[PDB]
Amino acid sequence: MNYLNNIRIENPLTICYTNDVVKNFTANGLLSIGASPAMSEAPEEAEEFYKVAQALLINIGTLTAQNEQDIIAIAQTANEAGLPIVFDPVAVGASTYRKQFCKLLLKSAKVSVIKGNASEILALIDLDAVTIAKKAYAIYKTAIVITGKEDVIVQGDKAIVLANGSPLLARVTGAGCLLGGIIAGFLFRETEPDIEALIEAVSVFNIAAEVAAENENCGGPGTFSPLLLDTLYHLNETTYQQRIRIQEVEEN
Amino acid sequence: MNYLNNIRIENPLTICYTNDVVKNFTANGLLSIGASPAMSEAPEEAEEFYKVAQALLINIGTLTAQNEQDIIAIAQTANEAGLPIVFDPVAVGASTYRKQFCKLLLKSAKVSVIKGNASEILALIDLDAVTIAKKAYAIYKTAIVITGKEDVIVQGDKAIVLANGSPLLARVTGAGCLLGGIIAGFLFRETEPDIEALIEAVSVFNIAAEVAAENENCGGPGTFSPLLLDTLYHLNETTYQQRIRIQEV
Amino acid sequence: MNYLNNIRIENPLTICYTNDVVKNFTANGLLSIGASPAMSEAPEEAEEFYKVAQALLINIGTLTAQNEQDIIAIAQTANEAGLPIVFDPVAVGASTYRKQFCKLLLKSAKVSVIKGNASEILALIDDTLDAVTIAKKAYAIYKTAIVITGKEDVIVQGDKAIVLANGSPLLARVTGAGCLLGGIIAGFLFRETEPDIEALIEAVSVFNIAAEVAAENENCGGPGTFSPLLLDTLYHLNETTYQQRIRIQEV
Ligand SMILES: Cc1nn(C)c(C)c1CCO
Ligand SMILES: Cc1nn(C)c(C)c1CCO
Ligand SMILES: Cc1nn(C)c(C)c1CCO
Ligand SMILES: [Mg+2]
Ligand SMILES: [Mg+2]
Ligand SMILES: [Mg+2]
């Protein structure tokens, strides 16, 4: 729990350019762990905001022509500011439009973490999630987080598999979108984040989910979501250490 | 409960072009009944998405000049793909802007279900909800669903009145907007849906509402909403069949 | 509780041009006290809607180029219609982009209530220390009711300044609490372009007392469960609870 303590004390400004289905939830998730979310989308204020921010989330969930050039521009402004970017290529394998855009973005800007499910990361690189993550790491030289039944993180010389969470998470819209935000919350302006911050980010989210789903007042996916936020807000070190399941670790 | 069982097993890709106040709630209500919502608004991906989707919801709740040509373009893409459209002409009677746009949309594309309240449907056509629904059906030759104190569905030669639900539903924003999305979830790519699918869609939503409002942890409109989602998620055949209150006119 | 009773009965149409993070919550908060929220953003329908509406909220939380000209246009349509505007200059102090826009808006239209935190109101007047002093300086510049939210809230309208001391710390941990409060204030205007300070005190007090009561509920387990409870509490709030809890001081 080292990084989450710091988020609660320092309240890191976390800029989110995210999709319209999950903006509120993302912001509430970030507030619950003690970050300071800001959903700024205007390239006109990116330079001023990014000087003082700790990370940027770019999530293309509801990509449209209105967003494309603005996303490219703010990614460049982030790179020039030294602001780390968490990129979520939502449903990139579902259309050529999203594929072509994600290729353009990743040619145009360096991101610090690419986060997606196996199908999304596979689609970016053109099979085990670990193999897909390592291939993506070799192509982008950027931390890769692949969410799934077990989560996989590849960063630097390590690959790790994590095994926490609840099935109710799949039934809440934007769970993995909120995870992108949480990961941005853990970066503290490090453009090459320590794998330990990414492990903590993913573990905090998934452990909170596990605990929320066991709460006696969790009656389904509607009641789960408020509980998940409560649980993120209250999560303590004892619970984190008792529950964390980090299942394999591979050093290159 | 035939169709709901199929939603839960097949997880139908349900495209929703909806308004900015209700996107999250709509996606969560669709996820709760087992559908796979996708809020795609880019005409550039409509052809790919629609080929594999089961329905499209078009809801004009926050219509602006940024949306108008895109909505027309995607509705045409949907027709070409055989993807059925559910159209919600939100607040159409409140402005000439919305009236003109809904007229344009309905001259540009064939829709599969038109859903609104009595005042919205009346404004489309220009006193009883049943009469209004039957007049609209005669104009558009498209299933009409009028939500209200009692709901009315008219499809082909049948008209039905349903009498389930809760007053709390009006106090949760986008209830009816979510209903539009639930209806889209029950279409399974049928451009002329069976009246039984529409009856089930409306009935599942309303009965879930009724049951959520009776829950001992429902303390008002704020706790009602998460309960509604739980109740949609858990709704079973037994409860459906015990509670459903339907009449053929 | 006077004005809240009228909201419950009259169901005032409350137009909200607000930010994308808080639309749904704002709308639900307005529904819970009995208002009729409408998130209309198209200038093409503003004249027709505004003729029948009771207030407009303008909140610039997620300002972009797509919004700028539209906001200016609707604000002018509101003035012409006699529709009172509640303006929330979110994060104005965080960029020159927002500062320039808020200066343009307030040179282009007359608003009826300006609501923000101390740092937001300060940035408005600086770019023209105590929250009371800030509120009075802003009132002098704009001749418009000022509401400054904070640990204690401040309201300045005409010759009166009031400090209110209700609420809960969980409100800060729910996104868009104060954004919703902008909406609630709009709900309490009833087409009065110079609202009585009493309406503003009630609007702020209803919200903060409901927050206080929600946070005491035995089912409140944190900021996730708090938000549904806040809505329930707004729905149920009664005069007995309001009069027992309200903590107000005239400066
Ligand atoms: C639902 C839905 N549709 N779209 C396009 C997105 C990004 C979502 C949320 C996924 O969790
Ligand atoms: C609230 C509100 N405003 N607008 C324009 C819409 C469609 C809503 C939700 C209605 O349930
Ligand atoms: C979070 C967040 N980001 N932005 C830009 C806005 C207006 C918010 C909601 C603050 O309550
Ligand atoms: Mg993803
Ligand atoms: Mg409708
Ligand atoms: Mg403010």
Residue numbers in the entry:
A (entry chain A): 1 to 126, 140 to 265
B (entry chain B): 1 to 126, 140 to 262
C (entry chain C): 1 to 128, 140 to 262
What does the paper say about this structure?
Out of this in silico selected set of molecules, two were chosen as the most promising analogues for further investigations: 2-(1,3,5-Trimethyl-1H-pyrazol-4-yl) ethanol, hereinafter referred to as compound 1 (cpd 1) and 2-(2-Methyl-1H-imidazol-1-yl) ethanol referred to as compound 2 (cpd 2). The thiazole moiety was replaced by the non-sulfur containing heterocycles pyrazole and imidazole for cpd 1 and cpd 2, respectively. Moreover, cpd 1 contains two additional methyl groups at position 5 and 6 of the heterocycle (respectively). The overall coordination of the THZ analogue compounds in the active site regions of the ThiM trimer is remarkably comparable to that of the of natural substrate THZ. Both compounds form a H-bond to the amide nitrogen of amino acid M39 and show a similar orientation of their hydroxyethyl groups. The activity of ThiM was analyzed in vitro, as described in the methods section, showing that the specific activities of cpd 1 and cpd 2 are approximately 1.5 times higher compared to THZ, however show only 1/10 of the efficiency (kcat/KM) in comparison to the natural substrate THZ. The two novel compounds applied for co-crystallization in this study lack the thiazolium sulfur, present in the natural thiazolium moiety of thiamin, which is replaced by a carbon atom, supporting slightly higher flexibility in the active site in consequence of the reduced van der Waals radius. Moreover, cpd 1 has two additional methyl groups bound to atoms 1 and 2, which can provide more hydrophobic interactions in binding co-factor dependent enzymes after complexation to the HMP moiety by ThiE thereby enabling the cpd 1-HMP moiety to act as a competitive inhibitor.
Here we report a detailed structure-function analysis of the kinase ThiM, which phosphorylates THZ in one of the first steps in vitamin B1 biosynthetic pathway. The quaternary structure of SaThiM is a triangular homo-trimer with dimensions of approximately 72 Å on a side and 47 Å thick with three independent active sites, each located within interface regions between two monomers. This fold of the phosphotransferase ThiM is homologous to that common to the group of ribokinase-like folded kinases. The three active sites, each located within the interface regions of two monomers respectively, are homologous to other known phosphoryl transfer ribokinase-like kinases.
